[PDB]
Amino acid sequence: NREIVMKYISYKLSQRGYEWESEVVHQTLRQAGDDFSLRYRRDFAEMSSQLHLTPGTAYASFATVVEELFRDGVNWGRIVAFFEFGGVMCVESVNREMSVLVDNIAAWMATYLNDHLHTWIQDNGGWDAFVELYGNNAAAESRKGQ
Ligand SMILES: COc1cc2c(cc1[C@H](CN1CCCC1)c1ccc(-c3ccc(C(=O)NS(=O)(=O)c4ccc(N[C@H](CCN5CCOCC5)CSc5ccccc5)c(S(=O)(=O)C(F)(F)F)c4)cc3)cc1)OCO2
To answer: Record's domain comment?
Structure first.
């Protein structure tokens, strides 16, 4: 998926004011990402406090985090974490006057989605099943998985 990436990044860049599947998939993913960033605010803040970003290290940083994220397997919340992480990297790139990196990060994200998440997503009911899970309350999400 690639539109999904560009629409996400464009939105995260907006929440900081900086200009760069059905609509309900894109809205739900935005909403789930915002949820993630609130619930894991310490990790978001730690990441910001400890991210050391240059164009020369940007790929290593991107690839290292993503590899740790999915090391024990894929699930929908880690896919949300993936989008949020890339969005933050793009935000931090623009903040540090390295805006060149945004297109690179978008490409890396789209490539990771296509090459390493597409199979899992298809096998787990597609983005339609993501939206279904988001709608269900915590108790109902555990029941559906079980
Ligand atoms: C390297 O790891 C990273 C990378 C990071 C990062 C944080 C991490 C850390 C690593 N830390 C730091 C060092 C090692 C430990 C991290 C890595 C992973 C996670 C994590 C935490 C929880 C889950 C998890 O619950 N996944 S889950 O079961 O599939 C799930 C549960 C609830 C939900 N949605 C629920 C929606 C509730 N609805 C209920 C009814 O009305 C509307 C809302 C709960 S909201 C939520 C959103 C995202 C993630 C977790 C909870 C979802 S979802 O929103 O994706 C949906 F499918 F529903 F659409 C998935 C998955 C991953 C948390 C933190 O920040 C961005 O970059």
So the answer is: BH1 and BH2 domains are required for the interaction with BAX and for anti-apoptotic activity.
Task: Report the alpha-carbon distance of residue 109 to residue 4 in Å, rounded.
Answer: 10
DSSP single-letter state for residue 115: I
Compute CA distances 112 → 19, 59, 132, whole Å: 24, 12, 24
Instruction: Check if the beta carbon of residue 108 is closer than 8 Å to that of residue 62.
Output: yes
CA distance 58 to 94: 13
Q: Which method resolved this structure?
A: X-ray
Ligand 1 within 6 A of CB of 36: yes
Amino acid at 94: V
Q: Does 32 contact ligand 1 (Cβ within 6 A)? A: yes
Whole-angstrom Cα distance, residue 86 to residue 5?
9
Instruction: Tokens 């915002």: give the residue.
Output: 34
User: Candidates 40, 42, 146: which one to mutate for ligand 1, based on the most atoms within 8 Å of Cβ?
Assistant: 40
Provide the b/e sequence for 65-79 (b: ≥16 CB within 10 Å).
bbeeebeeebebebb
